[PDB]
Amino acid sequence: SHVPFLLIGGGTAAFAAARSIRARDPGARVLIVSEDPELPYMRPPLSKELWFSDDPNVTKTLQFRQWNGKERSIYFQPPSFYVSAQDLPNIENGGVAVLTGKKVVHLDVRGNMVKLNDGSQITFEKCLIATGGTPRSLSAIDRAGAEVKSRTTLFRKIGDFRALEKISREVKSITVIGEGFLGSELACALGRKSQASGIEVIQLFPEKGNMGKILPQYLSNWTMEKVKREGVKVMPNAIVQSVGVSGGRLLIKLKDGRKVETDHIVTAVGLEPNVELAKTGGLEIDSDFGGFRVNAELQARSNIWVAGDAACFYDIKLGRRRVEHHDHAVVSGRLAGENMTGAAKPYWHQSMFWSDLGPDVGYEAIGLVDSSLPTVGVFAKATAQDNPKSATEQSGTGIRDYGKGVIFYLRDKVVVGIVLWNVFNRMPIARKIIKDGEQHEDLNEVAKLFNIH
Ligand SMILES: Cc1cc2nc3c(=O)[nH]c(=O)nc-3n(C[C@H](O)[C@H](O)[C@H](O)COP(=O)(O)OP(=O)(O)OC[C@H]3O[C@@H](n4cnc5c(N)ncnc54)[C@H](O)[C@@H]3O)c2cc1C
């Protein structure tokens, strides 16, 4: 068979593309192809809102409670929206179908055709690659035995949540490895769970403080203290020597002489993009940043675009980049869909990131953020509406004595990245400040733009 629009991967970016195509051309035939057996679902609530629900059948519905009491589904759309695969070419002025449980194992660029794992062959006219990425495993655990790995989770797709949620009510001690935002989002999840279950939740990492690769020492620490406060044993400066089983329990040997005894391990340590198809089709990978190299219009070659986590693209303001955001998967995927219908537009939009550690703490981020860069923070006492619960009350979604502040990351006294600590709805102002990029003289005056005095 054949289809005029072929989206590889069933992701957040892959969906955003199909919506944007069918908006510009209301009769288009679109076929997503998913390795995953499940239909397009957003990822963020897997580590946050789905733990803070009181329905014990949430595991089955996947209907979450936002911080404002509202309900929502993890699935982007119901299965009524989508049409069937077999009847897509035939159904007249038809919609958008998806082919679950099938992996695209070869790309023939000059043939405008792909092969699937089962031997199938689909030709196409326009094609998107939106494969996302594979979770990294810890080199300590790679070396360890077979018995050791059977108690080690990675976190990404739903099954990983269902797995760990069951494990949560079964054992006494669970250890989270990684200082990243996901690592911490998960620690605070088990933390609230621990207030009733009385289990042991440990977060350990080689870094000095929580999110210490991005946040400056003052806030990185404050956050370490805030995560502790939520019922967690935080262990900074932990370099894992070796891991093994002994006496029905895992034992983590640290390089600094300490030893940890626990029942289960979750590894939250970054993302390896799925550039597996780059060989067979002969497309270019970026050796620095990783992923598929594409231009400012997200194009790899004639008839092939790439978006989401998997896309190393060219921002003209900031330079060549690659980002693993949700907002990015959405906006990039949407643009790529416009270009597949001829719009030939550049990626002028600046993607944004957010995180929530309970409904009492929240971070917003845009641009180039890094602890290594020189940093200026401006802080002030937080008020009643400065928290993610109170902000969700207002719009109520998934982002369409100091308590709050702003952090400028800079290079030549001109701002190139921004982090916001419990300051909400002021993202459009941060976007303006990066795009403009002037020689700001007093960053105290710039902070007044985020209501910081
Ligand atoms: C727990 C969690 C929490 C997160 N929280 C936040 C947050 O708070 N804020 C934020 O901005 N971002 C967050 N993210 C990031 C966001 O979910 C990702 O950036 C988003 O999933 C990217 O969309 P994507 O389509 O590019 O990748 P994905 O959504 O991973 O989609 C890729 C899909 O394509 C499939 N695929 C891959 N290769 C093939 C192939 N060869 N053939 C067929 N199918 C294939 C994969 O199986 C996968 O299902 C979070 C992610 C996770 C996992």
UniProtKB/Swiss-Prot annotation:
Q: Which keywords are on file for this protein?
A: Acetylation, Apoptosis, Cytoplasm, DNA-binding, FAD, Flavoprotein, Isopeptide bond, Membrane, Mitochondrion, Mitochondrion inner membrane, NAD, Nucleus, Oxidoreductase, Phosphoprotein, Transit peptide, Ubl conjugation
- Subunit relationships: Monomer (oxidized form). Homodimer (reduced form). Upon reduction with NADH, undergoes dimerization and forms tight, long-lived FADH2-NAD charge transfer complexes (CTC) resistant to oxidation. Also dimerizes with isoform 3 preventing its release from mitochondria. Interacts with XIAP/BIRC4. Interacts (via N-terminus) with EIF3G (via C-terminus). Interacts with PRELID1. Interacts with CHCHD4; the interaction increases in presence of NADH.
Q: Which GO terms describe its molecular function?
A: DNA binding; electron-transferring-flavoprotein dehydrogenase activity; FAD binding; NAD(P)H oxidase H2O2-forming activity; NADH dehydrogenase activity; poly-ADP-D-ribose binding; protein dimerization activity
Output this protein's name: Apoptosis-inducing factor 1, mitochondrial
Reactions catalysed, semicolon-separated, are: A + NADH + H(+) = AH2 + NAD(+)
Which residues hold FAD?
A: 9-13, 35-36, 43, 48, 104, 156, 309, 325-326, 354
Where is it expressed, tissue-wise? Expressed in cortical neurons (at protein level).
Keyword Transmembrane helix attached: no
Q: What is the lineage of its organism?
A: Eukaryota, Metazoa, Chordata, Craniata, Vertebrata
Q: For this chain's UniProt record, which GO biological process terms are given? A: apoptotic mitochondrial changes; intrinsic apoptotic signaling pathway in response to endoplasmic reticulum stress; mitochondrial respiratory chain complex assembly; neuron apoptotic process; positive regulation of apoptotic process; positive regulation of necroptotic process; protein import into mitochondrial intermembrane space; regulation of apoptotic DNA fragmentation
Q: Which residues carry this modification: Phosphoserine?
A: 139, 242, 395
How does it get modified post-translation?
Under normal conditions, a 54-residue N-terminal segment is first proteolytically removed during or just after translocation into the mitochondrial intermembrane space (IMS) by the mitochondrial processing peptidase (MPP) to form the inner-membrane-anchored mature form (AIFmit). During apoptosis, it is further proteolytically processed at amino-acid position 101 leading to the generation of the mature form, which is confined to the mitochondrial IMS in a soluble form (AIFsol).
The entry's NAD(+) 2-binding residues are: 67, 364, 425
Where would I find the Glycyl lysine isopeptide (Lys-Gly) (interchain with G-Cter in ubiquitin) crosslink on this chain? 126
Q: Which residues carry this modification: N6-acetyllysine?
A: 259, 435
According to the UniProt record, where is the region FAD-dependent oxidoreductase? 5-354
Q: Please name the source species.
A: Mus musculus (Mouse)
Motif Nuclear localization signal is found at 317-322
Tell me which residues bind NAD(+) 1: 179-182, 207, 213, 270, 324-325, 354
**Into which family does the record put it?**
Belongs to the FAD-dependent oxidoreductase family.
EC number(s) of the enzyme? 1.6.99.-
Q: Where in the cell is it found?
A: Mitochondrion intermembrane space; Mitochondrion inner membrane; Cytoplasm; Nucleus
Composition bias of kind Polar residues appears in 384-400
- Which of the residues bear the PTM Phosphothreonine? 392
Described by its record, this protein's role is as follows: Functions both as NADH oxidoreductase and as regulator of apoptosis. In response to apoptotic stimuli, it is released from the mitochondrion intermembrane space into the cytosol and to the nucleus, where it functions as a proapoptotic factor in a caspase-independent pathway. Release into the cytoplasm is mediated upon binding to poly-ADP-ribose chains. The soluble form (AIFsol) found in the nucleus induces 'parthanatos' i.e. caspase-independent fragmentation of chromosomal DNA. Binds to DNA in a sequence-independent manner.
Q: Which GO terms describe its cellular component?
A: cytoplasm; cytosol; mitochondrial inner membrane; mitochondrial intermembrane space; mitochondrial outer membrane; mitochondrion; nucleus; perinuclear region of cytoplasm
What portion of the full-length protein is represented by this chain? Answer: 129 to 610 of 612
What cofactor is this protein dependent on?
FAD
Q: What class of enzyme is it?
A: oxidoreductase
